[PDB]
Amino acid sequence: VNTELKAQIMKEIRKPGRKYERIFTLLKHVQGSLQTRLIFLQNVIKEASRFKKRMLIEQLENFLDEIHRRANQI
Amino acid sequence: VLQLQKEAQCEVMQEIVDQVLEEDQLSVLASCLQELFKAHFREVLPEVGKPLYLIFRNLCQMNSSFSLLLDLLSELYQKQPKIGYHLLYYLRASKAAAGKMNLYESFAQATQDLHTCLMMDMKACQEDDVRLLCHLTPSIYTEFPDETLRSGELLNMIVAVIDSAQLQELVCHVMMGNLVMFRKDSVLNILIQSLDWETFEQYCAWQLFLAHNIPLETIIPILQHLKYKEHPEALSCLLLQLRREKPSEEMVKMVLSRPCHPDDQFTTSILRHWCMKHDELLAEHIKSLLIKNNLTLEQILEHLDNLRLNLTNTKQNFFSQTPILQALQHVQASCDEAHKMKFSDLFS
Amino acid sequence: QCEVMQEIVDQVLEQLSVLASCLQELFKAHFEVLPEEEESLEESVGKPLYLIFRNLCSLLLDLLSELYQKQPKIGYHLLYYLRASKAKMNLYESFAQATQLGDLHTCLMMDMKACQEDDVRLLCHLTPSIYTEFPDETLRSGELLNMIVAVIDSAQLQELVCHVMMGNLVMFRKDSVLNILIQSLDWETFEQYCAWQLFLAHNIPLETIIPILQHLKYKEHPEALSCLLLQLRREKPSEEMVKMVLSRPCHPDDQFTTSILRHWCMKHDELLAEHIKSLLIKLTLEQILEHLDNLRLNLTNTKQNFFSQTPILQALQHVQASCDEAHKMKFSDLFS
């Protein structure tokens, strides 16, 4: 499940433009524990920066911070 | 009274009365139509007869009434900025706006200048409707060259949101003579700006530059700005295009002016291609540049030593040429002993 | 260095499958294969698992074979070793022939796919030697090229382009590159872009792949058509180039043919007029006239007199008689 979402997200990252909606939709389906989702977000951020998509990275890092906080609460 | 009534036909036939009554404080009317014409600022392009465009219509068909309607549009534009590109679209789609792009300028003059509002409206269109931006770009560049050609911000807007299909459309527009995005006196600064953009943005910028009729010699100073760890997109595109050039002395000088880094294969790549296709001309250029700098001497000699080591995998004669042998012999004496030893195999 | 000295004893003692699973559990640690920097590669190959490769450099091969079945990443670990040790790749041939299928090409593809999934940097550093030492199992189609362009970034793309231009990397042969690009037409957008950039790095004549114009659809293949347009705009048309440009069917949104014809006519007017004269006098006639009418419409925004050249005019005058009346009126303004 998570590997398929990762494959689709990587396909989206390697496209031109700023259509980030599908990336967010696929991210909202990442299953597993919160640490698994943190690692998933980190890999997505790494690829996005491999393509220098900086504001997409800003948004993904907002996501990462919120997940970190909810994991700290749990 | 004439606004609280505000089917489409009744609405436009009333908006006309609104304008006619205006023709004999408009901020409050602007606020009320700002609220009443929401849900019309939603797509915009189809795959024209709305009540707001009626105002545009009047402005296209109408002296002091002209200024009055321009102030009304100014007030609504202050309340609703999207109006901006909705005007541009109108001036491109309506038959009433045939030969009246000038209106936009006067619109920009009546706002609370042309360059400012054009940049702002193109940015809003990029944020709201990428298809409309793509379809407006040719006419915006053609009608406002003095406000778009020197603008890296507009090109940034465009290359940020386009995909491969829209890039191909823009390329065909350029090659069919319908679109000009660069001019020789400003393209170099724009590409220097470009080196800070995202990956696909730089790829698109270079593909667009290649569609134009601007010689690479115009932008060849950008080589002094390209760092091999930071600008692989531009280095890729520029290398693949430098392949096809008969090299100038300035081009070889700019290539040799890149700092020597063992992990950077750009200089050896292009020098190998040129020496395989234009051995005598490249030897002449290298001899001239070696004698002129006597870009440092040792930089040139290290680049040539890298090329000499590389050329052993293909049969050739480039370093057996009289010009570069003459240059090496002429220039050995200016090195210090450490560099005389560093380049001993080359100086032989 | 302790378990290395022990591993030489393990190898010197000679079922090995239970031992293979024991070695899998014990070698779990090293499964980045590359160091961050000469001595780097030697220290890299100094680990235990590589001593068995060093010993192999037949009963050892079945231990490796049994090790492979359990740990598949062993395959590219072998390849890296055979490139990172002064201690060329014949050992990989023997190792691939021991697998269940035994097919060297397939074992190579599986190991390269595992490496692409597990470390893109190692794949990028192995690609030149894999193409050079196994050209036959790599050049004849674009499966490996597809693997590579699917994960590379702009930096690795520029590095591969430099490897090609420096003579240390061959990814296409002239006898297979056309079919490889044709099958690549099904790949992702950036994959196609990088494939075209690498092809351009190879300096293979555009004439070799210009037949691909029969497969390029304007709505479906904008990357390939973009690159091909930007490359063709720098060539002196060669008759076959114009022939394949004109063999594209006319569609309302397809602008490729008109753009390239406009460029060619505006800087190679007489040569293009001659090519079109010869093609008209010899792809259908009305399709050529149709492209010519599109070009005539486009040229009204300029001032060039390409249609005043007498080759074109006389070819039109001569061939009007061979059109039916419906097409005589369809192209009236051109025939005039």
Numbering used by the authors:
A (entry chain C): 808 to 881
B (entry chain B): 583 to 588, 593 to 610, 615 to 632, 634 to 638, 649 to 663, 667 to 716, 719 to 900, 919 to 972
C (entry chain A): 595 to 608, 615 to 631, 634 to 639, 642 to 661, 671 to 700, 704 to 898, 919 to 972
Would you copy out the relevant sentences from the publication that reported this structure?
To clarify the molecular mechanism underlying the assembly of the INTS3/INTS6 complex in DSB repair, we crystallized and determined the crystal structure of the INTS3c (residues 560–905, 915–995)/INTS6c (residues 800–887) complex. The structure of the INTS3c/INTS6c complex reveals an all α-helical assembly resembling the shape of a “butterfly”, with the INTS3c dimer forming the wings and one INTS6c subunit near the two-fold axis of the dimer interface making the body of the butterfly. The molar ratio between INTS3c and INTS6c is 2:1. INTS3c adopts a right-handed super-helical structure with 20 helices, in which each helix is paired with its neighboring helix to form an antiparallel helix pair. INTS6c contains four α-helices and interacts with INTS3c via two loops between α1−α2 and α3−α4. Two INTS3c protomers form a symmetrical dimer wherein two protomers are related by a non-crystallographic two-fold axis. Analysis of the dimer interface using Protein Interfaces, Surfaces, and Assemblies webserver (PISA)22 revealed a buried surface area of ~3400.0 Å2. The bulk of the hydrophobic core consists of Leu773, Phe806, Tyr809, and Leu846 from both chains of the dimer. The core of the interface is hydrophobic in nature with Pro823 and Phe858 of INTS6c juxtaposed against Phe806 from the two subunits of INTS3c. The interaction is further augmented by salt bridges between Lys859 of INTS6c and Glu839 of INTS3c, Arg825 of INTS6c and Glu804 and Glu807 of INTS3c, and Arg857 of INTS6c and Asp769 of INTS3c.
SOSS1 is a single-stranded DNA (ssDNA)-binding protein complex that plays a critical role in double-strand DNA break (DSB) repair. SOSS1 consists of three subunits: INTS3, SOSSC, and hSSB1, with INTS3 serving as a scaffold to stabilize this complex. Moreover, the integrator complex subunit 6 (INTS6) participates in the DNA damage response through direct binding to INTS3, but how INTS3 interacts with INTS6, thereby impacting DSB repair, is not clear. In response to DSBs, INTS6 is recruited to DSBs by directly interacting with INTS3c.
